Paper text:
In the current work, our control experiment of cryo-EM analysis on human TRiC incubated for 30 s with 1 mM ATP, a physiological concentration of ATP in the cell, further revealed the ability of human TRiC to close both rings, with a non-negligible population (27.2%) of such closed TRiC being detected.
Numbering used by the authors:
A (entry chain g): 15 to 526
B (entry chain e): 18 to 135
C (entry chain z): 6 to 526
D (entry chain q): 7 to 529
E (entry chain h): 6 to 99
Amino acid sequence: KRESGRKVQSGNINAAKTIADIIRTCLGPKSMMKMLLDPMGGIVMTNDGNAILREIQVQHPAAKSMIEISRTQDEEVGDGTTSVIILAGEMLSVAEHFLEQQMHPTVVISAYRKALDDMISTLKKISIPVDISDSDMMLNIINSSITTKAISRWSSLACNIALDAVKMVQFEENGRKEIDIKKYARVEKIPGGIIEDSCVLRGVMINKDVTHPRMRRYIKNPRIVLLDSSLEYKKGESQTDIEITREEDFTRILQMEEEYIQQLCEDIIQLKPDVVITEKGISDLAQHYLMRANITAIRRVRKTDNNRIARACGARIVSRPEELREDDVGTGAGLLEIKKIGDEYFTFITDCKDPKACTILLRGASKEILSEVERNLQDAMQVCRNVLLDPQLVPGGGASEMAVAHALTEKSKAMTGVEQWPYRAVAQALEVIPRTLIQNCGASTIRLLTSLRAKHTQENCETWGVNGETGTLVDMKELGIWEPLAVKLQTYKTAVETAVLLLRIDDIVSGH
Amino acid sequence: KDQDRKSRLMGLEALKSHIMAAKAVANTMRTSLGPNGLDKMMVDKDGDVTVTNDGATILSMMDVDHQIAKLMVELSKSQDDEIGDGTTGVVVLAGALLEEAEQLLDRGIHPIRIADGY
Amino acid sequence: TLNPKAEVARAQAALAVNISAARGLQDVLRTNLGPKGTMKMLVSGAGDIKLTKDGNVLLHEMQIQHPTASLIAKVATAQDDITGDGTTSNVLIIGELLKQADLYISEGLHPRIITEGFEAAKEKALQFLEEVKVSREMDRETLIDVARTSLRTKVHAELADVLTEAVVDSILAIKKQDEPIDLFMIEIMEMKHKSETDTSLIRGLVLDHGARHPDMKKRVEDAYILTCNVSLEYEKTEVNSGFFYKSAEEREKLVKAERKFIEDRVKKIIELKRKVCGDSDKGFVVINQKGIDPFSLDALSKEGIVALRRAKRRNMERLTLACGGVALNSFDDLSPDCLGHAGLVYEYTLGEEKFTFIEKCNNPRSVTLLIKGPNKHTLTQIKDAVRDGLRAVKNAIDDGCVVPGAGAVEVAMAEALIKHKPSVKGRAQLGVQAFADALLIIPKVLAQNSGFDLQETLVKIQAEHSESGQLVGVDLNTGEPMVAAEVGVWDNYCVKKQLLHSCTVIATNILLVDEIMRAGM
Amino acid sequence: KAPGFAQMLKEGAKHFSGLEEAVYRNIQACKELAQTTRTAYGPNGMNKMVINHLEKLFVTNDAATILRELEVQHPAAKMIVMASHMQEQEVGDGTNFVLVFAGALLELAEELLRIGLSVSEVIEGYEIACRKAHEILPNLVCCSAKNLRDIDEVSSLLRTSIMSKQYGNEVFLAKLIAQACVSIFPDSGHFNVDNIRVCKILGSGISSSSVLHGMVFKKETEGDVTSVKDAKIAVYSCPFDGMITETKGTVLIKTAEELMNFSKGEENLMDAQVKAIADTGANVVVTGGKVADMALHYANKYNIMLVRLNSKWDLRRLCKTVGATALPRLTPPVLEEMGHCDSVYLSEVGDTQVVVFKHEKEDGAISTIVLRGSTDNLMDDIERAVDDGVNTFKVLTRDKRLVPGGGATEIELAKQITSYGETCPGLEQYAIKKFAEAFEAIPRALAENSGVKANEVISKLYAVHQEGNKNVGLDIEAEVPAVKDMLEAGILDTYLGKYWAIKLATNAAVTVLRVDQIIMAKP
Amino acid sequence: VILLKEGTDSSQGIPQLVSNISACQVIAEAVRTTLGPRGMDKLIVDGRGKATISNDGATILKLLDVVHPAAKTLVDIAKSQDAEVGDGTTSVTL
């Protein structure tokens, strides 16, 4: 029914620790696999940490908060999600100071919040800048996601696809350098071909099918008209349908239906465009006038899709077709191609101009390959987005967590009070990241982790991480595990904030 | 057909069971014999109540499932065409002949031989 | 430590469950390996009995109760789709890899190190297979040895020689001048009321529905083939009209008017016959797929035509390529250019039905393999043995290299791995040692099914050594080491190559499963 | 939960482990099947009390009837049963042979497998010795049929086949079946068991039975027509009554005046229907249903013979003979669906009117054996003895070779195979010697059914066959264990009867040994 | 799992013959005391409730209708005794 007292905070630990203990071995390139039993007897062997916790039914409420926060992390960054839950579970894994020591939660919460500002300032000291003009340096960065995949052969092509696409969407004049993949970077798939044939289309491609055989197949200078309203007989303010039981009245309603549709379509063809793009649907009587003009009929195009077309060919959005002016034209468009590609109808408005957006064309032999190439380029574009926002890299392979753990230990000597004990626990909680990398490789954990702490004490903390494949110690200047700083900052801010949120709840009450 | 759950009574115990069923009717009417005989209470299926000591009327109102007990009732239809008074005396006499016949069956005398003696 | 209505195994016991699943499946399918092996019975529950030694059938069709063993059943499905053989030896190797690795895992060795040993041993065994294969040209004498080796396992060693000449001759005719070969060029048919030894070749195609009329010719020496999709039965009005009748008799009068469109088309068939080769010692055949009116059957029967109707789609497809007749959807376009050519056409009468033989053709690019058997399940067992024999010969002609059989290659690879020092990790040799002893399960199982000792048979074949190349194998009858190349025992190269790739990937993923969790179950 | 079930990975199908020996419990299923039909072998075989699925009480010693009534649900046991169905093909005898002999191979195979011999060596041992049996069997042929088509010779051969089925009637049924068989024999290759049809009639006893030509039906002629040569015959399964159309045809009967109108209408409907039969020229009409009283008047009006057959199988016999199909409607005038017959007349044999359909102009194999009996249970078993007798001579239409009966060939063939198994070295000698001892099951089962000690009979047979005296079988007597010459007694079996029986029974036992496990599957 | 009979009741050998002998004595027991002119009578009631009283052996056997298969054999012999002779059914059964 409900829980109260120390059992809530002690229960929230076991709930968050149990969820974390599953994916502990899912981190790293050597990460172990898992087995899920379907209710019908099926088996899913996927090692992806996002798919595992998605199919697991969790009873405890705090266990749901661990999953919902990880799902939000996937939207912003498609990497490092597993590291968030491991750190969020390890920081809460030490219950000694929580209960046995009889310390008040706010005393411990103040320790994490002070340790959070120190973990952020340490990463900026050990970071390194990046030259975004050279595409060779961006190649080894993206290869982190490309490795152990089937696109490794086309990896050289996969880099140019994600790099040039994000650079177009990035608008640096505003000062915030905002990049939106879910709109301007929108991707569609093309059946047929091979992986090499995949290129980056400059423009906005529409998947609308060809309804009638009369359309413009190829145009040197396309003309595009953008208007929101649908082409139909004008109705009343309500949705009430028109019911006519008399034949004489049918001729009165049909004449009004043919007159208004022909009137709006007459003002559209006055400019003589090559296509008509409407936001809503298009009736059958309206398509009869569109096929007579020998122009392409396009409908069901959202607002964001229309905003990109207006900046591409120079179009203009008008509320009603009767108000269309000469300002709406498609002048400047490269070509218009309705030609069938891969047994599917495509539309190319592509041009020589950069309307803060583009379209990615995915070629492939089968739909199984298309699904593999798609998801592999998605996170690769997010890697390009995270680097262009903060062009700074931090050493990976566990070198970043150990470099911060050494700074927290040295600073705790000057801290005087009861908060020094939980403040040092954060330094030992960051060692779980290099620990799982060694355990998955098979090498001894205690022997290597002890010698690793001696390297950051003497040598520079920017190097000497942990090799995941081999298992020994290697510098990060000689290896490509360098990771973007924007990912590590979001990881530590989320791991600490989630651990604080669960400690603040001392009672679970059921009611509405 | 319908051989299962078929009631069967055979052997020497069958004769002693038939006599016991016959003595139940004779012991009932022997109290009503004579002018001073006690009456009997009759409750009809419809709720009517009547009181009579007449033996022929009692046998008509008695509902008995046992087969030998039904034979005792069929005798009343034959005697009422002649006497109609001492009909009870015949049922009592029939019960006395069977009651004394029970002592003879223990000696090993065949039933047909007993019926020849009467 | 788990959520309600579920179960999880945190410790290594989750790995022990998967190992016990492979060992249980290994003991079931080890008895059917080799010709001396036994047979498994398939009961569908409806009273149907099926008997086959094929590993792909005993897995794909039979549903396994244990969840983990069902994954291996799906692997043999993709295994048979590529090579077509080796599904039985695939499971036996996977079971031994997990068994030999269990000895080292129980000592505290991490599974990842063992999996790295399999990858290093797979490349060494794959490069050693390069020197074993023989580049000799494929001829009739070699294809017989490949056919006998593949058939002897799926039959009683009786129909082998009967089915040997049927499989070899069917492949040689459909491939000339290094042309890509397709098994869809060969048709499989089944007849009843005949002994199982009556299986023979069919040069043409076997047709289901024959001709019905007393005057139909039982055999026609020469004739032309006219392909038609048109139905000659009763049809509605072709032009624009309707049903106008004052009685039941007037409606039947419009029937003759609607039939006039078809009856005039029936005369066009008779006209074309007399125009092109309408003299003596000639004939004509109607392969028309749709039905034909009985009255139209009488008009065509008097001219010597053998009518056909109610055919299938696959029949008309092969009759188009074999005979050469062009599909004609309307008889107004009827022309002699669409006529084909065929040899002797006769209908062999069975004890029940009658089938049509189009045989004696020049280059039909199609043949048929006719199977005869006393029962239904016997026909199914032979049909599986034929397709398994066709892919064995197809892979032998496509890839000009063949490898010795009878466990000669598996023993030869095990020796090179032991003498091979680790090229990657010092502790990776334990995985190589486990993979080396796993390749020895093939000659061991052949010794059990033959009724001999497992140890004595393996020691003799391993004791064979010389300066030059020496490859020996397990002899089932004698038991002594026997050279598989001399006695005509050969296997396909793509089969042995695919086992090394398949047994390595599947046995690796099983060792990589850390925990078993229940989702929604 | 650990420990798990042994060897069962599939659909809960019971899988016998190594110590469980799945092979033996499959032999045990086929062993119990042989014990049921082992006591029915021979002339002294015990009768079996069988309850039909219709809850009818049947008593018969026939083995083929038992397997139809007793449902065999064991898969490995069906292989021997399916071998018995193939045994009825190419020969009409040897059913009890396969059930007893196939079980004898499996009983002795259990003794070899306990020694540790492989199952593959036991399979190869039978197939080698089986080929030796087919070579020796021709040398055991003593006498052959003279091919004289004489009733004395034809009835003398039926004494063995009728024996073990109907006892005490061996003398009578020998001449009765002979008269029907000698009629077809002049036709080369035309002899067929379906051409001789048996029709049973309730009567005094078997001694009142006779033999007639053509198709003899127990149902008399409803019409007064005696004999007609009309070849047109129309079989109608619909009973004769008021003609009703497949449409609505609602008849509203209100007052007695209209009641007589529609009553006379049915007489007019039956008038036009029978008139359409005489218009087509068909004077013979077969009725599957009942016959109206007024229809008998129009039958004699147009001089059309009427036949009423209540049995459904009697109608199918005419459909496959003269070719007259039974139409669902009431007397459709269709000439194409009629039959052809040369002679049609009514006859009386045994104080019973019988209808005869034969061909006077065309020769024909058509013949009918009329049977009489008091009890339908005993009379039906006589029909089973006739089919086994007729099928015996269907084999003699091929090459005629006869072998001694009464277990005479079984001892002679087991003695010769034992010699080859002793000279042959290796491990195949074990399965060969057990293959020879499997022949001993027949004379043991034949002696036990006669109330004679089995070991005493087997000992005497080896003594007389060792000295070189052939043709010595088992004498049938209750108190006499001794033996007599079969050739002088007239007991002879069929060469092809034993040839095909040994081959089919061999492959039946081999296939069972090849299957070591039974697994259920799902579609 | 796989059973030959699957609920089929069958038995052979000596016990099957002994069981039939005990069943035949039950049929003869009912008509046993009815032999002779002076023999005792029997009382049989049907489903209607009426009682049939007589010493006739042919009438009693018709009303019993025993479901035992071997018992039906002796009943059928009594029916053949009526057509050939018409009496003695009690003597033949006993």
